[PDB]
RNA sequence: GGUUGCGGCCAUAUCUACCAGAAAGCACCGUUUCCCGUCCGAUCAACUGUAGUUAAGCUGGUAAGAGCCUGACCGAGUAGUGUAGUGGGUGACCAUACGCGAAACUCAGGUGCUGCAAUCU
RNA sequence: UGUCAGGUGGGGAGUUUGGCUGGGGCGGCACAUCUGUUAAACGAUAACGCAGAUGUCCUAAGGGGGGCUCAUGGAGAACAGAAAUCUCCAGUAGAACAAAAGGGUAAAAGCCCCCUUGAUUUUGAUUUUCAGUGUGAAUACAAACCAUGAAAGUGUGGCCUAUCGAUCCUUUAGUCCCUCGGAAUUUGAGGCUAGAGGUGCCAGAAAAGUUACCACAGGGAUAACUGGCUUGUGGCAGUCAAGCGUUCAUAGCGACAUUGCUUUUUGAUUCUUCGAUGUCGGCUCUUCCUAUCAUACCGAAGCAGAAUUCGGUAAGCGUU
RNA sequence: ACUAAUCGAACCAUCUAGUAGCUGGUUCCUGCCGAAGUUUCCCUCAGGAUAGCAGAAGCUCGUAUCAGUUUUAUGAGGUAAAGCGAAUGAUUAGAGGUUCCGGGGUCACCUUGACCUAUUCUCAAACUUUAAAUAUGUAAGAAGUCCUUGUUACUUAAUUGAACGUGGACAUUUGAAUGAAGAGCUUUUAGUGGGCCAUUUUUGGUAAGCAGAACUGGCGAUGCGGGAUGAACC
């Protein structure tokens, strides 16, 4: 009938049982939501610098 | 309704619930007069200051203050006359106590739900006090001292808990110790203001300091 | 009575022997167990722990 | 009933400080934010456009995006047993540079500087910081400084 | 709520691609137009025995309709839809407000 | 060092009274053809830097000034609080141990500081 | 008479008759949302906790720009009075900002004035609720086209925090696009992309009662008995003493408070019992408690005697 | 009411082993690991799905991209406290001062009806200047620091800058402390989704072995020594 509405008891026990863990930040994060003006550059800048090193590699 | 015994609301269980725009329908406090005796005497007329101080942290019901105030006045008045003292009820009845209204009639279980929506309606007022806070302050001439302590002793009996009669070293209701206030009053930095006194500060516009306190500048110069 | 920071008696979680029944595939493990142990070359250690992989973990090349 | 609106329980988090109401000082829009900068979040309530949620006030995270008037900040968030990544649209009025990171940066220039002279002379220049070490021995003289005794003071009502 | 009979809004009419003048009207649902796929199915399901076979709405909570505006480009005759918020009472371009006006009753 | 234009921090700059201001500058100030605007060239706009002028404004100074900003071994290690106890207390609460530690109050100071550019006895 | 159609038709048939809930029913909405507090200075946090509010309103009460400062107070000005309009001074906001509250706002986010429709299109990403799902709301952008401004810039509705709705079906718009599969055309239908018609039980069944004739599954997850916790309520006791008591507080009472005990009431609760603890009263019968009505022995009195009143030891003995 | 001891719908057989979110039962041992009663949604509250907690299968590597931790530095908060001679709201006592917007008593006539100022007392969950303690965000590098100059349709007045770079130099310490029990990732599934108590902070109630919450730890699932005895206390 009348049941307890809410109880955060043992909630932090549970989270720390498996450890509270960072998202393990990687180099080169996703360019997701990054300024579309900036992104439409970085494609071309990378395209230019790759061929430049390719031409440098001959 | 019959007044609930004070044993119920003795302690500071609940957070302060004063008269405000969220606390609309409340009765008024029983105590209305807070300064008694020769209340308009100057500060020097009543040098000795006695305090009735609670040693514990409870709630003084508003009307208990009124109840003790009439008793403290009544012994004091009849022993040393009307104008030999001035008592001030320091603490004030701001905490509004709550009562859950109940039906105790025949078979009241039907018409009443019990504890569903059991937020209590305002029952009265009380004065919240902590340890060491002054309840009553009487100021009088020093020879009157036996009378005021005994008179305060009769008032102590209307209060729950334990209270103490302390002979304060202050000069009356002032915040100055007796020997050094005498130096201040003698040096002339003190103008009465009906019931209390004005102090001359070393900081301020000198012209105003001269306006209120010519005697200090004359006393130093002379 | 000690506190236990980690799970006790925790199996290493890695295959130690091929839980296939294949006798020939255990002969190769017997050979490479000897080579991995009796040599300092990391290559034998690698191949020994690649012989235990399941069929899904041994994809065709 | 119960409310959990976008800005509930913010009676005091978005109050402008005492005598600090009104116009935001103009250095705010002048600070330059580059992707990788570590910034904290202190939402000055005066600017209503682009406020962060009340959870991020005080949370310090890196800037991943830089926009016309806003910058994009990454903040780790407590959700269950894992940290999530939260990319925020933040008007620059609500952020400021973190002074913790610049202290580390200026230290790095200090570490590089003293290591440079260590290359020439004085090897083992002791790069790493040292916490407060236990204090060494010393002599405490008494010329004119005889130890004056103290006694516990008797209880007085003082009232 | 009052909105004018005209509005200069966008027109993606493949020819305009720019803010153009519009004539605007209140959305009309239109005739139910039996032979619709649901109506053909519903008539087949309702015919026979068993009475009512699909739910019939009974409980009404809202009292408004989100008024939709039938934007109509004056040049290319392209019709577009714009939605407004809920409104108890709605008018189309009438009695333009004037601030410093008397208390006419 | 003063002034102006633009400012940074945003009262140490504010506020209320009094005093002072060489040179320059600022402003007040003079007039409505054009522009422009208002009930009203008072605002704004234009034009003369010409008739004058520190009275303003402004700037600086003065006040046992309020305020504001710092500090203080002044309050106060106070209130409060984290941890612990088979601590006291009927309870209310309180003391203790290991820590952290205020605010009001009082006292002592101070009253803008600079940045770019031009200019000035 | 046969078929079809319209009505009538609890005669009869099937089915339903929400949830939460200090048992249920009544009430209410705590069922979707919002503000402050509770909420214990990150966050999160409940109750049928408290104060309240929402299902709208606005072509302006949106957007931009320009001018000015508001509430109030004071001084004044024929009618003019506290309050008709004008003028000046002080005016840190004490006003206004559509609507609840809170936050925010001074050459403004307020009042007045000018122009306008960005309250538009394409989608995508992000924040809150969160499963990092949806809806809702919001932030930043990009590609466009517009609005305003001298420009910078601002604007993707209301200063911000609420103001709202899935699949199916209908309908409207767009793409003039796809399909109708034996070719073709046109109506017609079905698709794709944008909305609307609503589901407030608000992640969304289409749904009226009774059972004191009842039945089943169970439930002490939940009442009616008792017992237990507490004692508000009832009773009983105590401290102080303004007074009554001719005089006198305390012979006897005792207002105003205030401290306790009891489970001889009624409470509040749901811990035990729902695969049963036989549910009031009376008849009868025993024992126990003392908070004593009488009796034994006393003390006190405004007790001369007698009647009485209070109190002590005392439950042995009686109490029709 | 009665209708074969059966009646508010007989009896017999079948569909039928009808349905059950409900009750009871669910059979050998040992070993290792080992919980949950909470989120959200549901005509949902005796039940499910989903996340969480647990097992197993492991997989990639080999002391780290780590941590229920501290220090240092830098943020954020508005609770406790404190404050009303500080704002709003209240509030006790007085003291000093008014337009013809009231003298009510002789026309401007002392004239008791104001507010304003300097004090005084006590406050506040929906007040606050200020403001702790605890708890809380980030950082403490080799994915970094510095130098050189290449790409870009982006940005700047610019061959300025932004991002990514290219090549060069960066051990006693590769840039605080302590520890690491290996670290990281995946799959999959069981059970659970009725909780209860203790300290402290708490809300409603007079109070409760009352109802609801926050942190922590326990009992559930746990024996053993103590509290004569008891799930929680030591
Ligand atoms: Zn068009």
Residues 6+ apart with CB under 8 A from D82: A20, A21, A23
Tokens of D79: 């959700």
Q: Measure the CA–CA gap between B162 and B165, rounded to whole angstroms.
A: 10
Closest CA to D98 of D60, D68, D72: D60
Closest CA to B127 of B205, B66, B81: B66
Phi, psi of B63 (to 5 degrees): -80, -25
Closest CA to B93 of B164, B149, B26: B26
Q: In the complex, which nucleotide's C1' lies nearest to the CA atom of residue A35?
A: G141
Place of tokens 């209880």: D155
Beta-bridge partner residues of B61: B126
Contact exists between A and C (3 or more beta carbon pairs < 8 Å):
no
Tokens of D59: 């949370």
Is A21 at the interface with chain D, CB within 8 A? Answer: yes
CA-to-C1' span, B110 to G214 (A): 27
Is D82 at the interface with chain A, CB within 8 A? Answer: yes
Strand F: protein residues, Cβ closer than 7 A? B 11-12, 56-58, 131, 161, 200-207, 209; D 19, 25-28
Residues 6+ apart with CB under 8 A from B11: B58, B59
Which residues sit with Cβ closer than 5 angstroms to ligand 1, an ion?
A: E 11, 13, 16, 20, 73, 76, 78
Do A22 and D84 lie within an 8 Å CB cutoff? no
CA-to-C1' span, A57 to F47 (A): 74
Q: Residues of D numbered 99-158 whose beta carbons fall under 8 angstroms of chain B's beta carbons: which are they?
A: 157
Determine which of A14, A16, A26, A29 to mutate to test the interface with D (most D C-beta atoms within 10 Å): A29
Tokens of D46: 């005066």
Contact at 8 Å (CB) between B98 and B178? Answer: no
- For E68, the enclosing helix (H) or strand (E) is strand E65-73
Cα–Cα separations (whole angstroms), residue C11 to A42, B75, C42, C45: 48, 87, 23, 20
Buried b (16+ CB within 10 A) or exposed e, E52-70: eeeeeeeeeeeeeeebebe
Ordered alpha helix ranges (H), chain B: 62-80, 145-156, 178-187, 206-212, 214-221
Phi, psi of E84 (to 5 degrees): -115, -175
Write the DSSP assignment of D75-89 as a string of letters: EEEEETTEEEEEEEE
Do D83 and A21 lie within an 8 Å CB cutoff? yes
- For C32, the enclosing helix (H) or strand (E) is helix C23-37
Chain D CB contacts of B132 under 8 Å are 159
Q: Measure the CA–CA gap between D28 and D30, rounded to whole angstroms.
A: 5
Q: Considering only the beta carbons, identify the residue of A15, A33, A34 that sits closest to D81.
A: A15
CA-to-C1' span, D16 to G109 (A): 15
Q: What angle do CA B129, B133, B139 make, to 5 degrees?
A: 125
Exposed / middle / buried, residue A44 (Cβ in 10 Å: 0-12, 13-18, 19+): exposed
Please tell me whether any atom of strand G lies within 7 Å of the Cβ of D64. Answer: no
Q: What angle do CA C3, C8, C12 make, to 5 degrees?
A: 145
**Which of residues 51-80 of E have CB within 7 Å of strand G?**
51-66, 68, 70, 78-80
Please tell me whether any atom of strand H lies within 7 Å of the Cβ of B16. Answer: yes
Closest CA to B138 of B64, B46, B62, B43: B46
Is A36 at the interface with chain D, CB within 8 A? Answer: no
Place of tokens 């302050």: B137
Closest CA to E69 of E29, E28, E27, E30: E27
CA-to-C1' span, E31 to G188 (A): 16
Q: In the complex, which nucleotide's C1' lies nearest to the CA atom of residue D38?
A: H138
Place of tokens 């725009």: B21
CA-to-C1' span, B20 to G316 (A): 66
CA-to-C1' span, B11 to F52 (A): 82
Contact at 8 Å (CB) between E69 and E24? Answer: yes
C1' of nucleotide H126: residue with nearest CA: B22
Q: Measure the CA–CA gap between B31 and A21, rounded to whole angstroms.
A: 62
Sign of CA dihedral A20, A25, A29, A34: positive
Q: Measure the CA–CA gap between B162 and B9, rounded to whole angstroms.
A: 16
- CB-CB neighbours of A41 under 10 Å: 11
Nearest CA-CA distance, residue B160 and chain D, Å: 22
Q: Measure the CA–CA gap between E22 and E9, rounded to whole angstroms.
A: 7
Please tell me whether any atom of strand G lies within 7 Å of the Cβ of E92. Answer: no
Contact exists between E and D (3 or more beta carbon pairs < 8 Å):
no
- For E67, the enclosing helix (H) or strand (E) is strand E65-73
Please tell me whether any atom of strand G lies within 7 Å of the Cβ of E96. Answer: yes
Chain B CB contacts of D159 under 8 Å are 51, 53, 132, 134, 166, 168-170
Q: Considering only the beta carbons, identify the residue of A15, A22, A35 that sits closest to D80.
A: A15
Residues 6+ apart with CB under 8 A from B121: B25, B98, B99, B100, B101
Contact at 8 Å (CB) between B128 and B94? Answer: yes
| Side-chain-side CA neighbours of residue E28 (13 Å) | 4
Phi, psi of E51 (to 5 degrees): 65, -145
Nearest CA-CA distance, residue D71 and chain A, Å: 10
């Amino acid at each position: 009938a009348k049941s307890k509405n809410h109880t955060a008891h043992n909630q932090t026990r549970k989270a720390h049982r498996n450890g509270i863990k960072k998202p393990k930040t990687y180099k080169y994060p996703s360019l997701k939501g990054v300024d579309p003006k900036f992104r439409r550059n970085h494609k071309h800048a990378l395209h230019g610098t790759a061929k430049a090193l390719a031409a440098a590699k001959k | 309704m019959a007044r609930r015994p004070a044993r119920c609301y003795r302690y500071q269980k609940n957070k302060p619930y004063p008269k405000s725009r969220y606390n609309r329908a409340v009765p008024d406090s029983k105590i209305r007069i807070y300064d008694l005796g020769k209340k308009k005497a100057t500060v020097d007329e009543f040098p000795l200051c006695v305090h009735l101080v609670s040693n514990e942290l409870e709630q003084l019901s508003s009307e208990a203050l009124e109840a003790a105030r009439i008793c403290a006045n009544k012994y004091i008045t009849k022993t040393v006359g009307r104008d030999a003292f001035h008592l001030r009820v320091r603490v004030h009845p701001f905490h509004v106590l709550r009562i859950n209204k109940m039906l105790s009639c025949a078979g009241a279980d039907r018409l009443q739900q019990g504890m569903r929506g059991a937020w209590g309606k305002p029952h009265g007022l009380a004065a919240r006090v902590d340890i060491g806070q002054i309840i009553f302050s009487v100021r009088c001439k020093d020879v009157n001292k036996p009378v005021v302590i005994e008179g305060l002793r009769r008032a102590r009996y209307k209060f729950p808990g334990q209270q103490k009669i302390i002979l304060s070293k202050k000069w009356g209701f002032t915040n100055l110790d007796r020997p050094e206030y005498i130096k201040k009053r003698d040096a002339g930095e003190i103008k009465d203001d009906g019931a209390f006194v004005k102090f001359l500060s070393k900081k301020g516009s000198l012209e105003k300091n001269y306006n209120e306190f010519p005697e200090y500048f004359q006393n130093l110069s002379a | 009575g000690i506190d236990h920071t980690s799970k006790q008696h925790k199996r290493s979680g890695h295959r130690t022997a091929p839980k296939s029944d294949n006798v020939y595939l255990k002969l190769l493990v017997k050979l490479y167990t000897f080579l991995a142990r009796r040599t300092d070359a990391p290559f034998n250690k690698v191949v020994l722990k690649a012989l235990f992989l399941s069929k899904i973990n041994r994809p065709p090349v | 009933g119960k409310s959990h609106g976008y800005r509930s329980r913010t009676r005091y988090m978005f109050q402008r400080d005492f005598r600090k109401h009104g116009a935001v000082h103009l250095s705010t829009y002048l600070k330059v934010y580059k992707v990788g900068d570590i910034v904290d979040i202190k939402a000055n309530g005066s600017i209503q456009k682009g406020m962060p949620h009340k959870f991020y006030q005080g949370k310090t995270g890196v800037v991943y995006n830089v926009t016309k008037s806003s910058v994009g900040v990454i903040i780790n968030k407590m959700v269950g047993n894992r940290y999530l990544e939260k990319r925020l649209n933040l008007r620059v009025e609500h952020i400021k540079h973190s002074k913790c990171r610049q202290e580390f940066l200026e230290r790095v220039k200090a570490n590089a500087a003293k290591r440079a002279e260590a290359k020439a002379q004085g090897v083992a220049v002791q790069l790493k910081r040292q916490p407060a070490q236990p204090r060494e021995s010393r002599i405490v003289s008494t010329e004119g400084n005889v130890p004056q005794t103290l006694a516990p003071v008797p209880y007085e009502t003082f009232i | 709520v009052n909105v004018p009979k005209t509005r200069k809004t966008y027109c993606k009419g493949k020819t305009c691609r720019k803010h153009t003048q519009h004539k605007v009207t209140q959305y009309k649902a239109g005739k139910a137009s039996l032979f619709a796929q649901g109506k053909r199915r519903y008539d087949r399901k309702q015919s026979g025995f068993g009475g009512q076979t699909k739910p019939v709405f009974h409980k009404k909570a809202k009292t408004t309709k989100k008024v939709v505006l039938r934007l109509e480009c004056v040049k290319c005759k392209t019709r577009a839809q714009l939605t407004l918020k809920r409104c108890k009472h709605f008018e189309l371009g009438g009695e333009k407000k004037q601030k410093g006006q008397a208390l006419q009753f």
